[PDB]
Amino acid sequence: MSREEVESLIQEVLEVYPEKARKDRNKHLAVNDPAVTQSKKCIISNKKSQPGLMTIRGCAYAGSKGVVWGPIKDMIHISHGPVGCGQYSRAGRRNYYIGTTGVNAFVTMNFTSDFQEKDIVFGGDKKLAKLIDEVETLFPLNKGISVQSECPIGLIGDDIESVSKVKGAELSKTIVPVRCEGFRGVSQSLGHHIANDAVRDWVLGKRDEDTTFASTPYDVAIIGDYNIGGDAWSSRILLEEMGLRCVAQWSGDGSISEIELTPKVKLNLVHCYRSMNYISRHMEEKYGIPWMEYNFFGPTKTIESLRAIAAKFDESIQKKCEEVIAKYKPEWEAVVAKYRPRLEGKRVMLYIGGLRPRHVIGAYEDLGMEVVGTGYEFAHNDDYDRTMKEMGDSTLLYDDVTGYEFEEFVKRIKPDLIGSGIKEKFIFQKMGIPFREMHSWDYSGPYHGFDGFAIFARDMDMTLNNPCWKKLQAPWEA
Amino acid sequence: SQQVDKIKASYPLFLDQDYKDMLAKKRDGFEEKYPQDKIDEVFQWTTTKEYQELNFQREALTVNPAKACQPLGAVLCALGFEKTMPYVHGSQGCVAYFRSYFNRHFREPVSCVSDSMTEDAAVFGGQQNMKDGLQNCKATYKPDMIAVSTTCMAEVIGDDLNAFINNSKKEGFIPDEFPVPFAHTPSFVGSHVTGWDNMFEGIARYFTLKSMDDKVVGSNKKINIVPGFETYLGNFRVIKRMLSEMGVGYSLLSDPEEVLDTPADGQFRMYAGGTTQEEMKDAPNALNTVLLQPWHLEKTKKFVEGTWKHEVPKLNIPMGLDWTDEFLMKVSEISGQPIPASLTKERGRLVDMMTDSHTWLHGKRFALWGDPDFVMGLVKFLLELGCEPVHILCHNGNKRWKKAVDAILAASPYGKNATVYIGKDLWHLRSLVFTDKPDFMIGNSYGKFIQRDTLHKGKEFEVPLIRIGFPIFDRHHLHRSTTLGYEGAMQILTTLVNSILERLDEETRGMQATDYNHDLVR
Amino acid sequence: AMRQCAIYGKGGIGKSTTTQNLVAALAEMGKKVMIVGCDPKADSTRLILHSKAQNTIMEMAAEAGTVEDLELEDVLKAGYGGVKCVESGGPEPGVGCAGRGVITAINFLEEEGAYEDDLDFVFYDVLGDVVCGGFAMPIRENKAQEIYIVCSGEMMAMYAANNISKGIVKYANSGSVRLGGLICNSRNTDREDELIIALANKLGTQMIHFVPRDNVVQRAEIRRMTVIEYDPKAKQADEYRALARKVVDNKLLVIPNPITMDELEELLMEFGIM
Amino acid sequence: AMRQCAIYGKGGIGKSTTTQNLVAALAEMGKKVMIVGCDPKADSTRLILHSKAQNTIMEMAAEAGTVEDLELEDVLKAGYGGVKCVESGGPEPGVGCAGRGVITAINFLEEEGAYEDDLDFVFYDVLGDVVCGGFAMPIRENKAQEIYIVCSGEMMAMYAANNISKGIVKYANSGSVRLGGLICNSRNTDREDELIIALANKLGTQMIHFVPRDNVVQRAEIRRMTVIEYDPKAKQADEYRALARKVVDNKLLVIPNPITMDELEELLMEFGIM
Ligand SMILES: Nc1ncnc2c1ncn2[C@@H]1O[C@H](COP(=O)(O)OP(=O)(O)O)[C@@H](O)[C@H]1O
Ligand SMILES: Nc1ncnc2c1ncn2[C@@H]1O[C@H](COP(=O)(O)OP(=O)(O)O)[C@@H](O)[C@H]1O
Ligand code: ICS
Ligand code: CLF
Ligand code: SF4
Ligand code: ALF
Ligand code: ALF
Ligand SMILES: [Fe+3]
Ligand SMILES: [Mg+2]
Ligand SMILES: [Mg+2]
């Protein structure tokens, strides 16, 4: 658990690699040291993955279609390219929404151009135009269209921008071309950036000359919340009870109309800094809308964030925030009193994507658990700077960890619980360690606010204290 | 608010009054949603014949397809070999998606690697990526064989798998003797089953083509079994059990049964039992080769007939009664082993179950979809059972397969109301089940949404889904079921009859309204 | 100001050398001209930089990791007469994808300013074999507005010009790009002037200039520099200055009208013999 | 026999016409030859077929859906001397991806026989800009075993030949394909023969022949026919006959030895002036 032991473990794990792979991978494993916020602490991120090492990262298409654009309900998102890309991405994420699917909401559906050989050889711009015409014919109540590119689209130089412009002018529809080819970037982060750029270029400035919207001194926009299991609703009920008027949600149970109405708000409450800081900064520079980060994981973080948000408004909002915190205090007090004795002192290792490896630490600490290791898939150095103040001393930090690295680290540290994605769940359940899916909340949730903290504590207790983990070893063996 | 004693997850938490009011206020204030009357009108329109004709006039847009890309099937084929690592040459997002798909279907670890080709590799080629990835994979995960597939990005730019692997071996990145079979699997050609075919042909050609001089047909007194793209472990299990019970020497090539059903005993085995390299090398010496799924094993059949000089029998998938009988009879003819009494008793028990459940099964109307061979066998079994497969859909089918299924349907009186669709997706099937309503629909988990749609038109228009096929995501441990042989026929029969009985029990549960038919004995 | 031209034509017809000599003449006229090579062969800016510049966009993006870590000053250089030269990188023949490299280079140049300057002219020297949409990138909406085709009396050259006009048709209908004219670099064909004039009339465009085949151009290219720098008093230098003046004063921008195969066969059966 | 050769070179250097005339010379010699045009423009088999071949593999596959539904007869045509001619399809310039089309066409030819016949020579005429692996497809394992590069005295042709050798190296290392020799097409440069022979020596290869630049080829091509067919008594017909004889009798097949930019520059400075 000491620094020297963790460093020796790092070297032992890296020993198996070839020289080039070892030299690269040494820079992505580190031992946490607070009061040190930079990339000097032998941790670098946002780099190319080493080939043939079973990485967990996705593509820019996943970061654009699957993350930023897909949860938008009244919009048809077309996976332009071969089949498969959109089939694996179909309904795999739990961005919850309200609507009549197939007539006015299209989050679950899968629209694609289904490229063949002739589409590759002769191009697919005419096919894209015909596809847009058919989409308009068969789904009248769609409020917009987005065209998410895949790898061959970017290779063969298809002009989706011209088609989008012409068809939008012809049908008076908003068509957003996203050049989220999978080979672009090194992970989903470039997909986040490209999606934010497309939002800025094609959707954000639509209502610039419109002043019919009624502004209020209490206008806020929720940024970077994708409503995984209902998280955005759980946050929104708190924010609306404490006095604000949440105009927009970016981009979970969210519509194109509230995306266009975001430039009218007074404050931008950013949850996922990694995926949406670009559009937050753009709105700050253009419309002069301040943006502040907030955390709604666990009672401590949500109380602190609520007070910080209320500090930005008049004293009435702060008074209402005090009332809402007082009202919700006994519920989470009961939850901690029920579940903390069962989970006190348990050690957790996490490996999630760009924001959650550091945001969920407060909720785990509120339950008496210690996070003895964390890592990111696609986070940049600002994410690690934020993380280093939240994570314990002499604790493992990993960037774009490999399957072998994660397996060896878990074998040596021997945690009580691991929070990662679907591609490691059964690996670590085989080894006998309780596993919690921290992407989709293991098909449960929400985990935001106090209403989400109750479910979070219940799920952690359910998985950690299940009797199945006591039966891994057959009685006739030792 | 949450009661500590009774904690509510998203359902039914978001049915609370405060959440309902907040959601209504948000929708009314900032969503600019169409009025509910307009939405209802549009939905009712979508469930009509005019909408069906507009939907079937589609030529460029695909909505809710039922198929995947070739590298998924290539990975599944590569997983069936002993200590073999699937290696997709291309971009990493593809491999992440493949692993997530197979993890969600099998609830098992799925090992596959990528060389993580990027913009730089897209422009300059991925030969350096190939060398580095092969060396890293062999050093780290220590496989006995690396099977290389391709991503659409590498297929577009024309990356030469053979040249890249040869340069990797000649520059010392991997041993010259290490087996690295490869296959070109373009995602814009065919589907996942085509990728399985391509990968198996590549492995067979890697291990057999050069060493054809010393091979004699029938030397090892075995029958090669090529199972194709299979996602039911019970299918491999039943094929092996039937062949072993019959006393037949067999060589099941690309067996992934062990690696997809690893025991949980506190130890993680990345590799489990599969087809050995010795089996693959000795395969030409077998008496013959039987293809379990002949409608997506065309390239493999061509290679086996042209190189190994095996006369591959013209057998259908051993699904149902008649086709299992033909499969067993052909195996007996090829190997000379008589069919044992155990298989005769199993066939008799299947016939007995058919006889017992015929009254409930007869006349039922089914929509269904899946892969070509699976769909063909399911239609054959349904015709044997006396059911009516009204809507037969196969996205990855062709004209020859459609002709074969049409000939099968025309041979039975129960195929009069059946139409076969190729190149149609699940939006087409949603229109069909709205217009020509069947009793049930048999398919993967993606049909659940279709069922939901029907329930929105009314409880009397709902078409229940029976989950048989791939992928099955919303149910647990259904991949252990059997589909092939008499055992699979019994399992499918039980599932169908009990689904019918469950629906009938649900429809007659209303006391004083319809409970006069809530019969204890059925 | 801020004119934008692309140079297309049959492979090996002399697009690169003619473009470089035109650019040198324009710079001699005191104009500020930029040149972008859209060829995987990084040979479009040699005669201005007096060297095969190794600072191509794609290989330096490789050295810097991603394209997002690339800076304009790193790959942009100045040459003879203050001409700015940028080269799009490319793979070795028979590997990779050059169209993607051209797409990436053009997108990088657009994102990081580059053309957001006071430059009068921006030239896009494109390769002979336009085989994908990547090599038509200079012909997109906010890119080169006028296209010049370099051709010669050979019928494969005119078939290439016809095919390139067929390609230009789609990007002209969807944009504001137009065919300025046809440049003729003579290959000592028998009836070259009449043949190229007839082809231009059939396509609806005009003969902008005629460039005689002079070995002074090859001699200059051996010395890594243009005819203007090699021999300011040569007749070929005068012809290049006349061509530069013509393109400066050109005003006929017409959507191409491609002809069929049989029409071309008749064109050179009547205008190519005797 | 069944010798498979691939014709590469700089764009517009004359690979297509030289290949067609060579194939016709072989046809007069009693050899069974088949040409395959790996170019988006179907201009590589016009001379043998006396017309543009409209039955290209990729276009007919697009018309009939998938290339699997195609058949060899619908695309394989015979011409002068019984020379079978096959052409790969391709999109109009500036759209699609021609390399993928070439890959698909070659795979279709390989599956449906074509090569497996009594042909003595199988030629693959490739375009001048090999921008991707699709146009290196004829250089794969069981494809063209000899590569002939068409060069000229102009420096750009020399640099293109060096670049093409650089690209060839990665396929020659991993396979049995070898650079048979350089073919020189005259373009009236000063020291043509000296430059070509020096570049061949530096590359480690040989000059197969020196084809003179004569106007008869323009007249023969205008008539949509080969020079040997147009004027068997002409001097250029004798030169093409000698080129055919030397190609048939070539036994030198080596892995190319590419030279860097500085070596080519110094070679050209020494051998290209005066
Ligand atoms: N007007 C001309 N006079 C003499 N030689 C020329 C002329 N134009 C081109 N050339 C020769 O032809 C070759 C053309 O090469 P290049 O400009 O790269 O062709 P492209 O760029 O059109 O493929 C050059 O090497 C040059 O020596
Ligand atoms: N030896 C030669 N002498 C004179 N002209 C030639 C010669 N070889 C080819 N040509 C001319 O080149 C034109 C065809 O060029 P093409 O074959 O398309 O070039 P490449 O195949 O080298 O790219 C013909 O019109 C012909 O007149
Ligand atoms: S968007 Fe990002 S990988 Fe910020 S791509 Fe990923 S629904 Fe993760 S850690 Mo899946 S940067 Fe969201 C994420 Fe975090 S899909 Fe979800 S859980 S908070
Ligand atoms: S990195 Fe990302 S998911 Fe991969 S392809 Fe590229 S955009 Fe898509 Fe697509 S059809 Fe299948 S899954 Fe690929 S091999 Fe192509
Ligand atoms: S034809 Fe163009 S888009 Fe296709 S692989 Fe070659 S360079 Fe890339
Ligand atoms: F041969 Al080039 F641009 F150098 F067409
Ligand atoms: F033979 Al070409 F451009 F037609 F080099
Ligand atoms: Fe399991
Ligand atoms: Mg050039
Ligand atoms: Mg040619």
PDB file of N, CA and C in Angstrom, chain A residues 18 20 51-54 58 73 87-88 96 110 112 114 134 138 183 186 207 230 233 240 246-247 253 331 430 445 451 472, chain B residues 1-2 10 14 19 22-23 26 30-32 51 60-62 64-65 67-69 92 108 114-115 119 132 136 141 262 264 266:
ATOM      1  N   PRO A  18       7.159  -5.773 -24.496  1.00  0.00           N
ATOM      2  CA  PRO A  18       8.327  -5.429 -25.314  1.00  0.00           C
ATOM      3  C   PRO A  18       8.828  -4.035 -24.966  1.00  0.00           C
ATOM      4  N   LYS A  20       9.454  -1.191 -26.621  1.00  0.00           N
ATOM      5  CA  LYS A  20       8.688  -0.024 -27.051  1.00  0.00           C
ATOM      6  C   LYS A  20       7.386   0.101 -26.267  1.00  0.00           C
ATOM      7  N   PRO A  51      -0.610  -0.805 -29.985  1.00  0.00           N
ATOM      8  CA  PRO A  51      -1.350  -1.822 -30.742  1.00  0.00           C
ATOM      9  C   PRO A  51      -1.285  -3.205 -30.107  1.00  0.00           C
ATOM     10  N   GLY A  52      -2.382  -3.942 -30.252  1.00  0.00           N
ATOM     11  CA  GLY A  52      -2.436  -5.338 -29.845  1.00  0.00           C
ATOM     12  C   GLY A  52      -2.320  -5.583 -28.357  1.00  0.00           C
ATOM     13  N   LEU A  53      -2.889  -4.699 -27.536  1.00  0.00           N
ATOM     14  CA  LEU A  53      -2.793  -4.831 -26.089  1.00  0.00           C
ATOM     15  C   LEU A  53      -4.151  -4.887 -25.401  1.00  0.00           C
ATOM     16  N   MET A  54      -5.238  -5.062 -26.153  1.00  0.00           N
ATOM     17  CA  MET A  54      -6.589  -5.167 -25.601  1.00  0.00           C
ATOM     18  C   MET A  54      -6.945  -3.933 -24.767  1.00  0.00           C
ATOM     19  N   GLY A  58     -12.892   3.391 -26.991  1.00  0.00           N
ATOM     20  CA  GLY A  58     -13.719   3.348 -28.176  1.00  0.00           C
ATOM     21  C   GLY A  58     -13.179   4.231 -29.279  1.00  0.00           C
ATOM     22  N   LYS A  73     -33.574  13.518 -28.236  1.00  0.00           N
ATOM     23  CA  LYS A  73     -34.741  12.697 -28.551  1.00  0.00           C
ATOM     24  C   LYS A  73     -35.359  13.053 -29.896  1.00  0.00           C
ATOM     25  N   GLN A  87     -25.288  -0.712 -35.162  1.00  0.00           N
ATOM     26  CA  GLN A  87     -25.975  -1.851 -34.563  1.00  0.00           C
ATOM     27  C   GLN A  87     -25.420  -2.166 -33.180  1.00  0.00           C
ATOM     28  N   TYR A  88     -24.097  -2.129 -33.025  1.00  0.00           N
ATOM     29  CA  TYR A  88     -23.506  -2.332 -31.708  1.00  0.00           C
ATOM     30  C   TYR A  88     -23.801  -1.163 -30.784  1.00  0.00           C
ATOM     31  N   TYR A  96     -31.811   7.946 -20.446  1.00  0.00           N
ATOM     32  CA  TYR A  96     -33.258   7.846 -20.334  1.00  0.00           C
ATOM     33  C   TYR A  96     -33.943   9.055 -20.957  1.00  0.00           C
ATOM     34  N   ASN A 110     -32.282   2.770 -34.704  1.00  0.00           N
ATOM     35  CA  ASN A 110     -30.990   2.745 -35.381  1.00  0.00           C
ATOM     36  C   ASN A 110     -31.206   3.086 -36.849  1.00  0.00           C
ATOM     37  N   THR A 112     -29.382   4.035 -40.422  1.00  0.00           N
ATOM     38  CA  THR A 112     -28.089   3.851 -41.060  1.00  0.00           C
ATOM     39  C   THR A 112     -28.269   3.808 -42.569  1.00  0.00           C
ATOM     40  N   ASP A 114     -26.230   1.735 -44.415  1.00  0.00           N
ATOM     41  CA  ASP A 114     -25.946   0.342 -44.760  1.00  0.00           C
ATOM     42  C   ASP A 114     -25.132   0.245 -46.049  1.00  0.00           C
ATOM     43  N   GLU A 134     -36.223   9.986 -47.532  1.00  0.00           N
ATOM     44  CA  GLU A 134     -37.025   8.913 -46.949  1.00  0.00           C
ATOM     45  C   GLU A 134     -37.258   9.137 -45.460  1.00  0.00           C
ATOM     46  N   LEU A 138     -41.007   9.285 -43.859  1.00  0.00           N
ATOM     47  CA  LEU A 138     -41.517   8.259 -42.959  1.00  0.00           C
ATOM     48  C   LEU A 138     -41.595   8.695 -41.502  1.00  0.00           C
ATOM     49  N   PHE A 183     -11.465   6.331 -36.924  1.00  0.00           N
ATOM     50  CA  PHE A 183     -10.011   6.406 -36.878  1.00  0.00           C
ATOM     51  C   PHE A 183      -9.502   7.777 -36.453  1.00  0.00           C
ATOM     52  N   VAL A 186      -7.865   9.332 -30.802  1.00  0.00           N
ATOM     53  CA  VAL A 186      -7.320   8.132 -30.180  1.00  0.00           C
ATOM     54  C   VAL A 186      -8.378   7.475 -29.306  1.00  0.00           C
ATOM     55  N   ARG A 207     -31.292  30.548 -32.697  1.00  0.00           N
ATOM     56  CA  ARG A 207     -32.175  31.501 -32.035  1.00  0.00           C
ATOM     57  C   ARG A 207     -31.469  32.807 -31.686  1.00  0.00           C
ATOM     58  N   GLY A 230     -31.700   7.969 -15.425  1.00  0.00           N
ATOM     59  CA  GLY A 230     -32.465   9.035 -14.821  1.00  0.00           C
ATOM     60  C   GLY A 230     -31.678  10.003 -13.965  1.00  0.00           C
ATOM     61  N   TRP A 233     -32.779  13.741 -14.347  1.00  0.00           N
ATOM     62  CA  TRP A 233     -34.032  14.043 -13.661  1.00  0.00           C
ATOM     63  C   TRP A 233     -33.826  14.172 -12.155  1.00  0.00           C
ATOM     64  N   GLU A 240     -34.649  22.447  -9.387  1.00  0.00           N
ATOM     65  CA  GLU A 240     -35.909  23.157  -9.555  1.00  0.00           C
ATOM     66  C   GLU A 240     -36.606  23.384  -8.221  1.00  0.00           C
ATOM     67  N   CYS A 246     -34.492  25.234 -14.697  1.00  0.00           N
ATOM     68  CA  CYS A 246     -33.611  24.532 -15.625  1.00  0.00           C
ATOM     69  C   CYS A 246     -34.216  24.604 -17.020  1.00  0.00           C
ATOM     70  N   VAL A 247     -33.602  25.407 -17.888  1.00  0.00           N
ATOM     71  CA  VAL A 247     -34.141  25.597 -19.229  1.00  0.00           C
ATOM     72  C   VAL A 247     -33.732  24.447 -20.141  1.00  0.00           C
ATOM     73  N   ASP A 253     -32.238  13.771 -21.427  1.00  0.00           N
ATOM     74  CA  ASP A 253     -33.638  13.937 -21.791  1.00  0.00           C
ATOM     75  C   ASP A 253     -33.815  15.325 -22.392  1.00  0.00           C
ATOM     76  N   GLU A 331     -33.320  11.717   5.017  1.00  0.00           N
ATOM     77  CA  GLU A 331     -33.382  10.559   4.131  1.00  0.00           C
ATOM     78  C   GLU A 331     -31.997   9.958   3.912  1.00  0.00           C
ATOM     79  N   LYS A 430     -15.035 -13.808 -12.651  1.00  0.00           N
ATOM     80  CA  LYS A 430     -14.363 -15.103 -12.684  1.00  0.00           C
ATOM     81  C   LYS A 430     -13.311 -15.206 -11.590  1.00  0.00           C
ATOM     82  N   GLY A 445     -30.137   2.420 -10.986  1.00  0.00           N
ATOM     83  CA  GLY A 445     -29.973   3.845 -10.847  1.00  0.00           C
ATOM     84  C   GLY A 445     -31.299   4.552 -10.683  1.00  0.00           C
ATOM     85  N   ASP A 451     -31.817  10.820  -3.801  1.00  0.00           N
ATOM     86  CA  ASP A 451     -32.617   9.725  -4.335  1.00  0.00           C
ATOM     87  C   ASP A 451     -31.744   8.737  -5.087  1.00  0.00           C
ATOM     88  N   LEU A 472     -17.178 -19.555  -4.350  1.00  0.00           N
ATOM     89  CA  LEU A 472     -16.379 -19.725  -5.559  1.00  0.00           C
ATOM     90  C   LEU A 472     -15.551 -21.002  -5.519  1.00  0.00           C
TER      91      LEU A 472
ATOM     92  N   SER B   1     -37.801  11.781  -3.117  1.00  0.00           N
ATOM     93  CA  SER B   1     -37.756  11.170  -1.794  1.00  0.00           C
ATOM     94  C   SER B   1     -37.651   9.654  -1.892  1.00  0.00           C
ATOM     95  N   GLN B   2     -36.900   9.055  -0.972  1.00  0.00           N
ATOM     96  CA  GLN B   2     -36.699   7.614  -0.946  1.00  0.00           C
ATOM     97  C   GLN B   2     -36.956   7.086   0.455  1.00  0.00           C
ATOM     98  N   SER B  10     -35.056   3.540 -10.711  1.00  0.00           N
ATOM     99  CA  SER B  10     -35.667   4.478 -11.654  1.00  0.00           C
ATOM    100  C   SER B  10     -37.126   4.132 -11.921  1.00  0.00           C
ATOM    101  N   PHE B  14     -39.584   7.241 -10.834  1.00  0.00           N
ATOM    102  CA  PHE B  14     -39.988   8.363 -11.669  1.00  0.00           C
ATOM    103  C   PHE B  14     -41.479   8.380 -11.970  1.00  0.00           C
ATOM    104  N   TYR B  19     -41.883  13.876  -9.390  1.00  0.00           N
ATOM    105  CA  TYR B  19     -41.200  13.638 -10.656  1.00  0.00           C
ATOM    106  C   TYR B  19     -42.139  13.828 -11.838  1.00  0.00           C
ATOM    107  N   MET B  22     -42.598  17.597 -12.258  1.00  0.00           N
ATOM    108  CA  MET B  22     -41.394  18.221 -12.792  1.00  0.00           C
ATOM    109  C   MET B  22     -41.215  17.899 -14.269  1.00  0.00           C
ATOM    110  N   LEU B  23     -41.449  16.643 -14.650  1.00  0.00           N
ATOM    111  CA  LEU B  23     -41.312  16.251 -16.045  1.00  0.00           C
ATOM    112  C   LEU B  23     -42.352  16.941 -16.917  1.00  0.00           C
ATOM    113  N   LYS B  26     -41.265  20.585 -17.333  1.00  0.00           N
ATOM    114  CA  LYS B  26     -40.146  20.687 -18.264  1.00  0.00           C
ATOM    115  C   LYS B  26     -40.613  20.525 -19.706  1.00  0.00           C
ATOM    116  N   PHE B  30     -40.099  23.868 -22.104  1.00  0.00           N
ATOM    117  CA  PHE B  30     -38.881  24.018 -22.889  1.00  0.00           C
ATOM    118  C   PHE B  30     -38.703  22.973 -23.983  1.00  0.00           C
ATOM    119  N   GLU B  31     -39.654  22.063 -24.174  1.00  0.00           N
ATOM    120  CA  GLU B  31     -39.474  20.985 -25.136  1.00  0.00           C
ATOM    121  C   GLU B  31     -40.071  21.280 -26.503  1.00  0.00           C
ATOM    122  N   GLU B  32     -41.048  22.184 -26.587  1.00  0.00           N
ATOM    123  CA  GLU B  32     -41.745  22.482 -27.840  1.00  0.00           C
ATOM    124  C   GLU B  32     -42.288  21.205 -28.473  1.00  0.00           C
ATOM    125  N   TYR B  51     -48.733   3.568 -44.807  1.00  0.00           N
ATOM    126  CA  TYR B  51     -47.398   3.667 -44.238  1.00  0.00           C
ATOM    127  C   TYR B  51     -46.579   2.430 -44.562  1.00  0.00           C
ATOM    128  N   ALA B  60     -32.783   3.545 -49.747  1.00  0.00           N
ATOM    129  CA  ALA B  60     -31.533   4.097 -49.248  1.00  0.00           C
ATOM    130  C   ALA B  60     -31.425   4.116 -47.732  1.00  0.00           C
ATOM    131  N   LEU B  61     -32.537   4.178 -47.013  1.00  0.00           N
ATOM    132  CA  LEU B  61     -32.532   4.253 -45.560  1.00  0.00           C
ATOM    133  C   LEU B  61     -32.794   2.875 -44.970  1.00  0.00           C
ATOM    134  N   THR B  62     -31.996   2.502 -43.975  1.00  0.00           N
ATOM    135  CA  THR B  62     -32.181   1.269 -43.226  1.00  0.00           C
ATOM    136  C   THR B  62     -32.482   1.628 -41.779  1.00  0.00           C
ATOM    137  N   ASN B  64     -33.330  -0.013 -38.037  1.00  0.00           N
ATOM    138  CA  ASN B  64     -33.287  -1.191 -37.179  1.00  0.00           C
ATOM    139  C   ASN B  64     -32.929  -2.447 -37.966  1.00  0.00           C
ATOM    140  N   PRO B  65     -31.711  -2.551 -38.488  1.00  0.00           N
ATOM    141  CA  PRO B  65     -31.325  -3.755 -39.229  1.00  0.00           C
ATOM    142  C   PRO B  65     -31.194  -4.953 -38.304  1.00  0.00           C
ATOM    143  N   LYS B  67     -28.551  -7.592 -38.516  1.00  0.00           N
ATOM    144  CA  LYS B  67     -27.288  -8.158 -38.969  1.00  0.00           C
ATOM    145  C   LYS B  67     -26.168  -7.291 -38.418  1.00  0.00           C
ATOM    146  N   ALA B  68     -24.962  -7.841 -38.428  1.00  0.00           N
ATOM    147  CA  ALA B  68     -23.758  -7.138 -38.013  1.00  0.00           C
ATOM    148  C   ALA B  68     -22.734  -7.202 -39.146  1.00  0.00           C
ATOM    149  N   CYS B  69     -21.523  -6.731 -38.874  1.00  0.00           N
ATOM    150  CA  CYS B  69     -20.467  -6.706 -39.875  1.00  0.00           C
ATOM    151  C   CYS B  69     -19.594  -7.953 -39.782  1.00  0.00           C
ATOM    152  N   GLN B  92      -9.761   0.676 -33.104  1.00  0.00           N
ATOM    153  CA  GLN B  92     -10.063   0.039 -31.826  1.00  0.00           C
ATOM    154  C   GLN B  92     -11.541   0.091 -31.460  1.00  0.00           C
ATOM    155  N   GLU B 108     -19.942 -13.514 -20.681  1.00  0.00           N
ATOM    156  CA  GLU B 108     -18.660 -14.180 -20.553  1.00  0.00           C
ATOM    157  C   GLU B 108     -17.575 -13.217 -21.002  1.00  0.00           C
ATOM    158  N   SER B 114      -6.832  -5.284 -31.098  1.00  0.00           N
ATOM    159  CA  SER B 114      -6.766  -4.430 -32.271  1.00  0.00           C
ATOM    160  C   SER B 114      -5.396  -3.775 -32.319  1.00  0.00           C
ATOM    161  N   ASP B 115      -4.965  -3.416 -33.523  1.00  0.00           N
ATOM    162  CA  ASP B 115      -3.730  -2.663 -33.669  1.00  0.00           C
ATOM    163  C   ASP B 115      -3.952  -1.159 -33.604  1.00  0.00           C
ATOM    164  N   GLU B 119      -5.653   8.009 -37.731  1.00  0.00           N
ATOM    165  CA  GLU B 119      -5.528   8.858 -38.912  1.00  0.00           C
ATOM    166  C   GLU B 119      -4.183   8.661 -39.602  1.00  0.00           C
ATOM    167  N   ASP B 132       3.928  -4.108 -34.711  1.00  0.00           N
ATOM    168  CA  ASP B 132       3.916  -3.817 -33.285  1.00  0.00           C
ATOM    169  C   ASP B 132       2.805  -4.576 -32.573  1.00  0.00           C
ATOM    170  N   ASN B 136       3.367  -7.318 -29.664  1.00  0.00           N
ATOM    171  CA  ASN B 136       2.816  -7.027 -28.344  1.00  0.00           C
ATOM    172  C   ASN B 136       1.838  -8.105 -27.900  1.00  0.00           C
ATOM    173  N   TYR B 141      -0.209 -11.766 -24.178  1.00  0.00           N
ATOM    174  CA  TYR B 141      -1.257 -12.742 -23.931  1.00  0.00           C
ATOM    175  C   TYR B 141      -0.855 -14.161 -24.297  1.00  0.00           C
ATOM    176  N   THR B 262     -16.601 -20.811 -19.413  1.00  0.00           N
ATOM    177  CA  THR B 262     -15.543 -21.053 -18.442  1.00  0.00           C
ATOM    178  C   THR B 262     -16.119 -21.063 -17.029  1.00  0.00           C
ATOM    179  N   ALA B 264     -16.501 -20.388 -13.069  1.00  0.00           N
ATOM    180  CA  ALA B 264     -16.100 -19.337 -12.137  1.00  0.00           C
ATOM    181  C   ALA B 264     -15.635 -20.012 -10.853  1.00  0.00           C
ATOM    182  N   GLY B 266     -12.669 -18.638  -9.073  1.00  0.00           N
ATOM    183  CA  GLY B 266     -11.625 -17.785  -8.551  1.00  0.00           C
ATOM    184  C   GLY B 266     -10.415 -17.637  -9.439  1.00  0.00           C
TER     185      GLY B 266
END
